[PDB]
Swiss-Prot record:
Name of this protein: Endothiapepsin
Coiled coil (residue ranges): none
Catalytically driven reaction(s): Hydrolysis of proteins with specificity similar to that of pepsin A, prefers hydrophobic residues at P1 and P1', but does not cleave 14-Ala-|-Leu-15 in the B chain of insulin or Z-Glu-Tyr. Clots milk
Origin: domain of life: Eukaryota
Gene from which this protein is expressed: EAPA
Any one GO molecular-function label of the UniProt entry: aspartic-type endopeptidase activity
Cystine crosslinks: 255-290
Amino acid sequence: STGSATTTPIDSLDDAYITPVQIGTPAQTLNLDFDTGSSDLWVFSSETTASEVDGQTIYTPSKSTTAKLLSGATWSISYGDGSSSSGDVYTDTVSVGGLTVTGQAVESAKKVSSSFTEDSTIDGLLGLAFSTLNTVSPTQQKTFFDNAKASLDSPVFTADLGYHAPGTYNFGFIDTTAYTGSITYTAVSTKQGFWEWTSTGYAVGSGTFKSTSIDGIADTGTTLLYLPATVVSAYWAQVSGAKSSSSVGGYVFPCSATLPSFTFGVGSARIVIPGDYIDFGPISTGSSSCFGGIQSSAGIGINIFGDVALKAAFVVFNGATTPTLGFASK
Ligand SMILES: CCNC(=O)CSc1nnc(C(C)C)o1
């Protein structure tokens, strides 16, 4: 089997991408944030505290003839950005782009943190990191990818995120028309349960490539590119007037600037992020200070190849016995 679904930016900045997902019978379609940095499929639901729902579409398990309470199971997750959610668990039929999994754990939120309530466009998350990170207790549940893997034509999914445009998540096949050149594959560690790999270095603009190992994760659920402070300082030093602002929470730059590109290494291959992908616009409406798309990871504990980096590539998440990642230009 295969599946193919379009993913659409939630706003004009590509802050996140939503993909329609069919849950239950008859189908309830919710727009989920596919997140290769986490492993829970959770949704706003008829159980979510009413004051914490503000425009999201909800899953109502009582209206699904295939829903079953997973008795005793609870979940609770906290994300790197400080947001969180928790609740109980149903199993139900879940379909993405024509690919159907029966008995998928659908984690129904009883509580969500304010940032979720305040984003009416995201109805939940669909985790695509390894199932070792899933938070369901006392019986840890499998991700949609884990459950579908045996049925797929090939045990892969691909992320093809658009810049200010829709893109595609495919399951079970690699669309050879969706990229240019060749795909370069690189080794993955699932020891922390993330899609973890080592970039071979970077360049700023037209500058020389610096060969240096940068361990990080491929994370579709993170907007920006978070790299070591040395790398980030080298980038922003090429933008007149750019500076790190403790009050804003990262590097800002004059909105009048033209940003240089940023290249990262994948083995001997190179992925070029155009400068325009690094512009996240005014820090507040009307401001001439703009927020940068490359930020320091120093306070995180891990480097994160988020959407800024991934949308410059066609990315293969190969979930075979030896997990690898593939990157191609497009
Ligand atoms: C196909 C997705 N599989 C899982 O999420 C299982 S947990 C997991 N942790 N490491 C692995 C292997 C792929 C190395 O698997």
